[PDB]
Design a protein around this ligand. Structure first.
Ligand code: ACO
Lengths: 68, 278, 275, 118
């Protein structure tokens, strides 16, 4: 019983490791896509740039810590 | 003939039971029921208590389906386009017809804007009253139909509806007057609002003010201003132009008015720009 | 008139609406926030309890019952728009079954696609417009096989009783064929705008604006998907932290019971380079 | 098929979408800030447990282990609740834009089926 708990914990620590890595990628990808797509009609301006217009990146409070 | 009599028996909207006053083109099958249920958020009608229960368990709407354009600690206002929210506005017109004798549901709700006043709660925003407005009115009416729901009447909500209607006209840089066939209860409320705002404006200005200057600051038409002055016996005619003065009565009315401590609309809390129709 | 109070109000109106700091931005319709358009009445629930679930090992829920009836209602309107002409000629379950399979209720195909794109593949794509009670319900295709025929037999009779019209009371709308009856129950007539066409050049220019607007919606959809993914993996992360926390406590208890030393590296977090 | 009508209808349908995206995303940010402050609340209590293990091992019990474990589990649980809300909010924004995009792609397809749109 002791061996089973230790082995399925290394797998869950690995998954946490995997989720943190893909999380960091998405954060960067979001920031890069904001730069590519927004630099007439915009989801930012009204369909009819600035570092404060990054409403997608500013949704993460981790990105707010970085910028400040 | 049929439209000249009360259509429904008794209606339970939310927690308050209301007794309709006039005919309303609800589904005629509902006229055979003792109770009709009206959802407090979607204004949907129900004859079956079971259908009502199932509906409430699946309904996630907790406020008028539109943008919140005003909010204080007392009431909030929502702007709803009839073209965008067909189902909700139809339900509102059906509900309002119960208490408006001359309201017409002949055509669909597309050509109207609906400004709905709500009070916030733990459950959400509860509709207490509203007023409609033509998107393009030939006569320049700033209000088509205006209604305070019977469960919230005699609480000053009707005054807040009229105030907000003029705050929209002031933000539009236009003068406005409610649609001309005013009901007996509706006329009584507008005369009270027109007197209160005119008396307050004259007293605080403390200087002679022109009719055109009053019309510019309050968005009231010159017709309504002159008529309000005649009632207060403060209008006179000199050299082809009308002049409004001040007497003991107005200063006395201003004192009793200020003591009432009524709730008012704060224009600084109105985040709203006039819709643009092509 | 409106002094009176309803006593069962607290049963029908439960939940909490949380106020936001900034003004509400909303445009979804009533249909968007209501869920399945079919709602059982008292007659439907007695049938479900006494005829369907009386001795069944597999329970059909009220929510699942409405899913089936809503698909029947949508299919019949498509295949038999003029059912009122001959209500008794309503299609059988087997005849309507192919249409039921292809049915796309409440943007199911769109939600299923979004659920696939996010990399979730778990639970269902859930929005602010969806109630939590719907979580338990089985997929429609599975319901069609287990309960489709039995429920349709019941729904068929109710459809015949109302002469091919709707079971739920409907507003009276104007009919093109009939002369006006000066009927006060007829309401909400529609009058089209009927505007002249623009010049062909403006059509070409607007066709170009349409392609440009299409690209911007694609760009916004990509960002919306990335944010959904970021929150999805963040949900996976906190679910791991909960499971890791319970897997660490249990190991420590068993380890202390056997008095084993060392191997603590999985019981403590380790700092690493994080952007 | 009228491209000018399709463009007019599409702009009217999408007129409120940028406002909704800002509204939804700033609520996600408002919740993510609450999540970070709650993350520090359990990571600090979890650091106390880990500091003990580094010096004495997992065999001795931390003097406040039973008390800290209940508080960490509690704070970790309300973190999951906040994170679920952000997922729901993120899904709505994705749902709204995807539904508007699908309707536009259907119109473009209908325009391409005629010689109207190239
Ligand atoms: C455009 C037209 O057609 S007008 C149609 C107006 N709408 C209707 O008639 C529908 C039914 N009535 C209502 O919905 C409401 O009563 C409204 C909209 C008229 C006003 O709403 P209320 O909240 O009741 O008005 P409110 O409480 O703010 O008071 C405003 C004034 O109306 C007066 N008033 C309101 N109800 C009554 C009443 N039942 N009897 C006598 N006076 C009344 C008040 O005395 C008050 O005047 P005051 O300052 O001298 O005291």
């Amino acid at each position: 019983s002791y061996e089973a708990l230790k082995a399925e914990l290394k797998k869950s620590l690995q998954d946490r490791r995997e989720q943190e890595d893909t999380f960091d990628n998405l954060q960067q990808e979001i920031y890069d896509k904001e730069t590519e797509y927004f630099s007439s009609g915009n989801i930012i301006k009204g369909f009819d740039f600035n570092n404060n217009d990054r409403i997608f990146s500013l949704s993460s409070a981790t990105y707010v810590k970085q910028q400040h | 003939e049929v439209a000249r009599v009360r259509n429904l028996n008794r209606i339970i909207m939310g927690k308050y039971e209301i007794e309709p006053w006039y005919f309303s083109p609800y589904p005629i099958e509902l006229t055979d029921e003792d109770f009709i249920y009206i959802d407090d958020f979607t204004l949907q009608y129900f004859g079956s208590k079971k259908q009502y229960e199932r509906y409430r368990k699946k309904c996630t709407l907790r406020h008028p389906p539109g943008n919140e354009i005003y909010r204080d600690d007392y009431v909030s206002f929502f702007e709803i386009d009839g073209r965008k929210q067909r189902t909700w506005c139809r339900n509102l017109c059906l509900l309002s017809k119960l208490f408006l004798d001359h309201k017409t549901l002949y055509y669909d709700v597309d050509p109207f804007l609906f400004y709905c006043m709500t009070r916030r709660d733990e459950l959400g925003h509860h509709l207490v009253g509203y007023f409609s407005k033509e998107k393009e009115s030939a006569d320049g009416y700033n209000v088509a139909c205006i209604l305070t729901l019977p469960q919230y009447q005699r609480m000053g909500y009707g005054k807040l509806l009229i105030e907000f209607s003029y705050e929209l006209s002031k933000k539009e840089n236009k003068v406005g007057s409610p649609q001309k066939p005013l009901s007996d209860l509706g006329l009584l409320s507008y005369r009270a609002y027109w007197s209160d705002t005119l008396i307050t404006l004259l007293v605080e200005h403390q200087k002679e003010i022109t009719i055109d200057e009053i019309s510019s600051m309050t968005s009231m038409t010159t017709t309504d201003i002159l008529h309000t002055a005649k009632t207060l016996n403060i209008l006179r005619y000199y050299k082809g132009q009308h002049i409004i003065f001040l007497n003991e009565d107005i200063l006395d009315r201003y004192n009793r008015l200020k003591a009432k401590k009524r709730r008012t609309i704060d224009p600084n809390r109105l985040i709203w720009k006039p819709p643009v129709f092509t | 008139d409106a002094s009176m109070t309803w006593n069962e109000y607290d049963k029908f109106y439960t939940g909490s609406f949380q106020e936001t700091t900034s003004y509400i931005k909303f445009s979804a319709t009533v249909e968007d926030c209501c869920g399945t358009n079919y709602n059982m009445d008292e007659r439907d629930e007695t049938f479900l309890n006494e005829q369907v679930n009386k001795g069944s090992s597999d329970i059909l829920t009220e929510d699942e019952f409405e899913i089936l009836c809503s698909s029947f209602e949508h299919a019949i309107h498509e295949r038999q728009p003029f059912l009122s002409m001959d209500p008794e000629s309503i299609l059988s379950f087997e005849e309507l079954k192919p249409t039921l399979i292809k049915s796309d209720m409440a943007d199911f195909n769109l939600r299923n696609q979004l659920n696939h794109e996010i990399n979730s593949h778990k639970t269902h794509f859930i929005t602010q417009f969806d109630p939590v009670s719907q979580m338990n319900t089985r997929p429609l295709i599975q319901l069609i096989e287990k309960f489709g025929s039995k429920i349709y037999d019941y729904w068929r009779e109710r459809k015949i009783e109302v002469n091919g019209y709707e079971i739920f009371p409907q507003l009276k709308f104007e009919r093109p064929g009939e002369k006006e009856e000066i009927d006060p129950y007829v309401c909400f007539r529609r009058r089209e705008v009927r505007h002249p066409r623009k010049t062909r050049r403006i059509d070409i220019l607007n066709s170009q604006r349409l392609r440009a607007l299409h690209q911007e919606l694609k760009n916004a959809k990509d960002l919306a998907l990335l944010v959904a993914k970021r929150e999805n993996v963040s949900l996976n992360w906190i679910n791991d932290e909960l499971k890791i926390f319970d897997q660490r406590v249990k190991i420590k208890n068993l380890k202390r019971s056997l008095n084993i030393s060392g191997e603590d590296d999985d019981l403590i977090n380790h700092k690493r380079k994080r952007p | 098929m009228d491209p000018s009508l399709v463009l007019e209808q599409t702009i009217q349908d999408v007129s409120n979408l940028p406002s909704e995206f800002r509204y939804l995303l700033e609520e996600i940010g408002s919740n993510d800030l609450k999540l970070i402050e709650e993350k520090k609340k359990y990571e600090q209590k979890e650091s106390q447990i880990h500091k003990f293990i580094r010096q004495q091992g997992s065999i001795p019990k931390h003097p406040q282990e039973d008390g800290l474990d209940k508080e960490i589990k509690e704070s970790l649980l309300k973190c999951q609740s906040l994170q679920r809300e952000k997922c729901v909010l993120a899904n709505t924004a994705l749902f709204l834009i995807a539904r508007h995009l699908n309707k536009l792609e259907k119109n473009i397809a209908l325009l391409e089926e005629d010689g109207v749109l190239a």
